[PDB]
Amino acid sequence: TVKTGIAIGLNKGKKVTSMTPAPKISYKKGAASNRTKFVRSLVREIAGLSPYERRLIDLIRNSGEKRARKVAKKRLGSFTRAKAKVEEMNNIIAASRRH
Amino acid sequence: WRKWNVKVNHNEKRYATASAIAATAVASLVLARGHRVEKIPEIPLVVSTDL
Amino acid sequence: GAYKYLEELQRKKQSDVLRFLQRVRVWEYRQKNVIHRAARPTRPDKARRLGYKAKQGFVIYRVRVRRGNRKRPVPKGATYGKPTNQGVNELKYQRSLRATAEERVGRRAANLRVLNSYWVNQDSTYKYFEVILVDPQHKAIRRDARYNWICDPVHKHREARGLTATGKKSRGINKGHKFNNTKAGRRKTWKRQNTLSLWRYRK
Amino acid sequence: AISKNLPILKNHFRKHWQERVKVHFDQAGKKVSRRNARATRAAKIAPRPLDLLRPVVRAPTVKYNRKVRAGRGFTLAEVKAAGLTAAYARTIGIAVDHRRQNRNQEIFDANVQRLKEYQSKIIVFPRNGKAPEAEQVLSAAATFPIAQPATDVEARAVQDNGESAFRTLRLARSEKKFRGIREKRAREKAEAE
Amino acid sequence: PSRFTKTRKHRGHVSAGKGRIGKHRKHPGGRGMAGGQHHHRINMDKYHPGYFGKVGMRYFHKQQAHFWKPVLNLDKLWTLIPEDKRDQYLKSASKETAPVIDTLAAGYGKILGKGRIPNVPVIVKARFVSKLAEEKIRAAGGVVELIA
RNA sequence: UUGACAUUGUGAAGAGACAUAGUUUC
RNA sequence: GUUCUUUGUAAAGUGCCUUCGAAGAGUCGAGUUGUUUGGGAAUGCAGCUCUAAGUGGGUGGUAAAUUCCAUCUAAAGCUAA
RNA sequence: UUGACCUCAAAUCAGGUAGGAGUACCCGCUGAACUUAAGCAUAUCAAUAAGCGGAGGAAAAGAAACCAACCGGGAUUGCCUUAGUAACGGCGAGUGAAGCGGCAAAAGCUCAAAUUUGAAAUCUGGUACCUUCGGUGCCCGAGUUGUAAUUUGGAGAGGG
Ligand SMILES: [Mg+2]
Ligand SMILES: [Mg+2]
Ligand SMILES: [Mg+2]
Ligand SMILES: [Mg+2]
Ligand SMILES: [Mg+2]
Ligand SMILES: [Mg+2]
Ligand SMILES: [Mg+2]
Ligand SMILES: [Mg+2]
Ligand SMILES: [Mg+2]
Ligand SMILES: [Mg+2]
Ligand SMILES: [Mg+2]
Ligand SMILES: [Mg+2]
Ligand SMILES: [Mg+2]
Ligand SMILES: [Mg+2]
Ligand SMILES: [Mg+2]
Ligand SMILES: [Mg+2]
Ligand SMILES: [Mg+2]
Ligand SMILES: [Mg+2]
Ligand SMILES: [Mg+2]
Ligand SMILES: [Mg+2]
Ligand SMILES: [Mg+2]
Ligand SMILES: [Mg+2]
Ligand SMILES: [Mg+2]
Ligand SMILES: [Mg+2]
Ligand SMILES: [Mg+2]
Ligand SMILES: [Mg+2]
Ligand SMILES: [Mg+2]
Ligand SMILES: [Mg+2]
Ligand SMILES: [Mg+2]
Ligand SMILES: [Mg+2]
Ligand SMILES: [Mg+2]
Ligand SMILES: [Mg+2]
Ligand SMILES: [Mg+2]
Ligand SMILES: [Mg+2]
Ligand SMILES: [Mg+2]
Ligand SMILES: [Mg+2]
Ligand SMILES: [Mg+2]
Ligand SMILES: [Mg+2]
Ligand SMILES: [Mg+2]
Ligand SMILES: [Mg+2]
Ligand SMILES: [Mg+2]
Ligand SMILES: [Mg+2]
Ligand SMILES: [Mg+2]
Ligand SMILES: [Mg+2]
Ligand SMILES: [Mg+2]
Ligand SMILES: [Mg+2]
Ligand SMILES: [Mg+2]
Ligand SMILES: [Mg+2]
Ligand SMILES: [Mg+2]
């Protein structure tokens, strides 16, 4: 940061000689691991694609990422997961049938 | 939940207690107020600390 | 460990394998009685993260509760009241199915204590659950320093007082602004903010 | 029941209020007990204090950042720095706190220094169960009074480079407000082929 | 109390000074603020213009403390300095040594200028100033120091 | 009462799209 | 205060280098319906339909798309005043 | 033919546990209308009364999927304030909380997920003996569809 020093501005606040603390891992609760990468990728190949996932990949072939987003945006929670979800597919696509 | 106790101003309490004190001299009053002092040395009455 | 795999696999619930299972399993559960004890858990990984243990005194019961809304049980629909409260049919019960699951079994085996429960399967008439219970009489437990908390009398019928996970959910206890209304636990906090603090030296 | 030129009052006694009425008749009878039950702790809890060392900590919001107020516990950071593991320092009547975080040096050190003064002005007894009786100071934070940190002198030379303060307040005000619009006028500025 | 009270005086007076013709019944108007817009409207409009309706914007989850900002006028200013030390400065005041005042630390948010401080240099640290405030400070030969 | 969705799975002829290869839909 | 057995080829505490760092799913979330809340394009709760992810996830009291930033780590658990 | 294993049954099997009561206070469910509005339907009374389940000497909450937006704070409960405020409402009648600040009291933690794998290291019961809220020897059983040690995110593990 470094604050302006004044009590309104585009970086308000008292100036202090700073510290920045060692980081928490509870700040990585998301982050991957190679265990879960294996276990997850593996369980995929066993169990395969589900009902929507199938018709998702086909949508992507015969109707772009636009209809695929909007479709899955109704199936799933909403837009952002829908987004990351079609992603997953272009890869499952590219993976097998492609390169 | 009647109002039982009373909030008195902290500063009057003083002015009161003070006034109260000033009169425990004042011969006439101590007398007027009961208290057979009809014939004690001097008012205020100061006894030894040995008491 | 096998578990982590089980974990993952059960998140693919519409996976060809899993839904084969799910139909053959759900039909079996239906031919037994509604309250009926299970040999081993059917989700060893799940059961275990909810606090299960394979040593004596750890019980697993399986139970059936119907789906649906609560039909206000009024005769002929008849409400005799104002009309905001003419409500008979779109009405839905503050507690969860899982909650009514735990209760009907914990009644069934009074002596055990309900530890926790987990979803297994539903169909269109039913959700099914496995409830895990602990014999707090049974020695292996009392001496197990980790669970013997359960042996205290303040956990008598924790499932009816809504102190299981699900009840705690239903009951609305989490920290923070979305839960001001319910958190210290609704009515206690109502009655709080509904009492008249009169002091001796009235402020 | 509207009449005369009075204010409009909003007194909420329409529920069943006579039911939830807490007179503190026992204000006295709670002090006593509280006193009575503090004393028994001092007594029980050996020559130990009643409290734990708390850290300074600057208070939140605009309103209260001016001043600095006693804390919760000392942060694995301060603790370490004044040369002890927490686990121990929890048994030395210090308050630890894995939640507070260190982003302020001035405030850091203060604590770590305040941590010194403690280890200094205390004594620990041996394990052994040999009790060399010492006599208790009651309150740790009485002995170690957290104080407000002076930030200037009383007098100094006047430094008027001339710039209103006001207007540099007015201007900073602007700058923030059109920060966004300006930024589009570069994006758009670059859009020109 | 009960014995200086009037209801002691009305004893033996049939109607308790409530009236014979139109008595003292339960709730003639209605209760509280009933009929604001109707039978009790003369008393609303005048005595309470503006009562009904709506103005302004809503603010969701306002929290004052946000908008904290005690104001202190030049009007005072010198009060912020402890008494004895204060004369010390008034006589003998110029650059090199002019007294410093932490209007924040006194607990104010802004300085406004309500007229007339002595011709004495003062170094003034605040979070906010009026245009005039800070002007008539310069007028003395002090300056304003901006903080947080 | 009537429709959608969930329970609801398996074949076959016929319709419906990448627009006259069969994954999808009646 | 004492007194006896020494629990030990045990147990724990800290410093540097290295590789890692597993973290709860018919859940979170979404639609709808009913309820409730000061909570306002929706405070919690519940029923049915939908139903995730791992640089993820929740929250940030006005809906949405975009880019950031801040803050914590849910879906298991115990506990005195 | 003999032997298991899974699942399920039966005994007046060996030993245990639940019920009813009480219910001021507590954790839940369910759930009014009188009433106010000068009528009344929303609203209000009220997330009250009645009804139903479950605890304790307290219950519950509790060591953050928190508050914030600061120079940031740091489990939960309660008091003083916040405030009859932000907000809600035939925006009517009526409603109505939170963050901060002072204080009271303070206290922290546990699992799941990990290969002990050069040795299930764990455990109810039966029994014999003793220094019996327990200890040891031994047998049956439990248990690998995982009992212990280790680790719980503040970390932490493995090699050095
Ligand atoms: Mg068994
Ligand atoms: Mg009724
Ligand atoms: Mg209604
Ligand atoms: Mg069916
Ligand atoms: Mg409320
Ligand atoms: Mg009064
Ligand atoms: Mg009131
Ligand atoms: Mg204390
Ligand atoms: Mg000793
Ligand atoms: Mg009187
Ligand atoms: Mg009076
Ligand atoms: Mg008289
Ligand atoms: Mg008279
Ligand atoms: Mg008379
Ligand atoms: Mg008469
Ligand atoms: Mg009169
Ligand atoms: Mg009369
Ligand atoms: Mg008349
Ligand atoms: Mg109004
Ligand atoms: Mg003035
Ligand atoms: Mg049909
Ligand atoms: Mg978790
Ligand atoms: Mg709705
Ligand atoms: Mg209800
Ligand atoms: Mg709603
Ligand atoms: Mg958004
Ligand atoms: Mg923070
Ligand atoms: Mg546990
Ligand atoms: Mg608890
Ligand atoms: Mg206890
Ligand atoms: Mg028997
Ligand atoms: Mg009973
Ligand atoms: Mg009701
Ligand atoms: Mg009333
Ligand atoms: Mg009444
Ligand atoms: Mg009426
Ligand atoms: Mg009337
Ligand atoms: Mg009527
Ligand atoms: Mg209502
Ligand atoms: Mg009742
Ligand atoms: Mg009892
Ligand atoms: Mg007590
Ligand atoms: Mg408790
Ligand atoms: Mg934690
Ligand atoms: Mg707190
Ligand atoms: Mg009003
Ligand atoms: Mg209300
Ligand atoms: Mg405080
Ligand atoms: Mg503890």
Side-chain angles (χ1 to χ4, degrees), chain D residues 53 55 73-92 94-98 100 102 107-116 119:
Chain D
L53 218 288
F74 261 102
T75 90
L76 324 183
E78 278 119 278
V79 179
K80 177 159 199 185
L84 51 182
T85 82
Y88 182 69
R90 328 208 61 122
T91 51
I92 303 305
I94 316 197
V96 211
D97 180 17
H98 62 288
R100 193 168 95 265
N102 260 294
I107 245 288
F108 184 59
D109 300 16
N111 285 341
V112 227
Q113 207 257 353
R114 182 175 155 88
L115 271 205
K116 264 69 177 291
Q119 278 153 109

Side-chain angles (χ1 to χ4, degrees), chain E residues 41-57:
Chain E
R41 130 117 89 130
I42 320 230
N43 183 280
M44 288 312 246
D45 315 19
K46 152 250 194 57
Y47 300 154
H48 296 293
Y51 178 85
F52 285 84
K54 272 184 182 177
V55 318
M57 342 186 284

Side-chain angles (χ1 to χ4, degrees), chain A residues 13-30:
Chain A
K14 173 57 207 314
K15 218 181 294 283
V16 170
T17 81
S18 66
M19 257 220 57
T20 127
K24 322 231 227 98
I25 18 73
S26 47
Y27 243 125
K28 281 165 84 171
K29 213 257 183 69

Side-chain angles (χ1 to χ4, degrees), chain C residues 22-188:
Chain C
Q22 186 273 330
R23 194 181 0 177
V24 191
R25 294 200 157 168
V26 75
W27 160 89
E28 181 193 322
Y29 297 145
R30 222 150 39 191
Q31 320 286 326
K32 331 204 116 179
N33 320 286
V34 159
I35 304 152
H36 75 248
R37 201 255 190 78
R40 49 259 1 252
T42 342
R43 278 136 140 253
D45 64 288
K46 160 65 65 179
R48 107 182 268 81
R49 63 185 139 277
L50 283 193
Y52 173 85
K53 232 67 206 190
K55 75 195 290 75
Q56 287 134 335
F58 265 78
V59 156
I60 302 299
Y61 253 100
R62 191 202 286 96
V63 100
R64 211 149 102 222
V65 285
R66 309 177 142 255
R67 292 143 112 357
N69 303 348
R70 170 141 143 89
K71 168 178 191 151
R72 196 173 277 174
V74 264
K76 299 159 165 290
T79 249
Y80 325 92
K82 253 83 118 78
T84 322
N85 325 342
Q86 264 181 34
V88 178
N89 235 134
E90 259 158 298
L91 274 51
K92 341 224 158 186
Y93 203 28
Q94 285 310 341
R95 286 168 77 68
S96 154
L97 261 322
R98 191 182 168 200
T100 293
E102 284 165 356
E103 243 221 12
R104 295 221 232 234
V105 13
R107 288 209 302 276
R108 165 58 126 93
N111 50 309
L112 280 36
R113 302 295 173 72
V114 173
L115 187 70
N116 229 245
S117 72
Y118 55 79
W119 173 88
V120 279
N121 196 343
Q122 57 212 23
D123 60 46
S124 81
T125 305
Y126 290 118
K127 278 174 169 169
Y128 306 77
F129 306 86
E130 264 157 27
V131 208
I132 117 184
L133 306 89
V134 173
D135 195 3
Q137 335 298 351
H138 193 296
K139 277 299 183 173
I141 287 89
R142 293 173 101 82
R143 10 205 64 162
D144 184 315
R146 296 204 170 77
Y147 286 100
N148 60 359
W149 65 264
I150 254 296
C151 292
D152 239 81
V154 294
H155 296 88
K156 255 121 82 186
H157 279 285
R158 29 154 31 198
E159 81 275 5
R161 275 183 304 166
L163 292 160
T164 50
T166 178
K168 272 226 189 97
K169 222 277 198 223
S170 316
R171 277 188 41 225
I173 312 108
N174 291 64
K175 301 198 176 90
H177 72 267
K178 305 162 68 41
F179 297 79
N180 295 340
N181 248 269
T182 173
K183 171 225 282 272
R186 174 175 93 233
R187 353 209 169 184
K188 150 176 164 133

Side-chain angles (χ1 to χ4, degrees), chain D residues 116-135:
Chain D
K116 264 69 177 291
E117 256 131 39
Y118 185 73
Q119 278 153 109
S120 115
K121 298 278 266 55
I122 59 167
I123 97 254
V124 187
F125 291 17
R127 307 293 241 78
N128 313 342
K130 57 163 59 244
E133 194 81 84
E135 148 227 351

Side-chain angles (χ1 to χ4, degrees), chain E residues 66-83:
Chain E
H66 261 247
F67 315 96
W68 181 88
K69 194 181 270 182
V71 319
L72 172 69
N73 270 128
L74 290 210
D75 199 46
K76 298 298 178 61
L77 223 215
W78 282 103
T79 43
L80 296 201
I81 293 163
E83 301 200 343

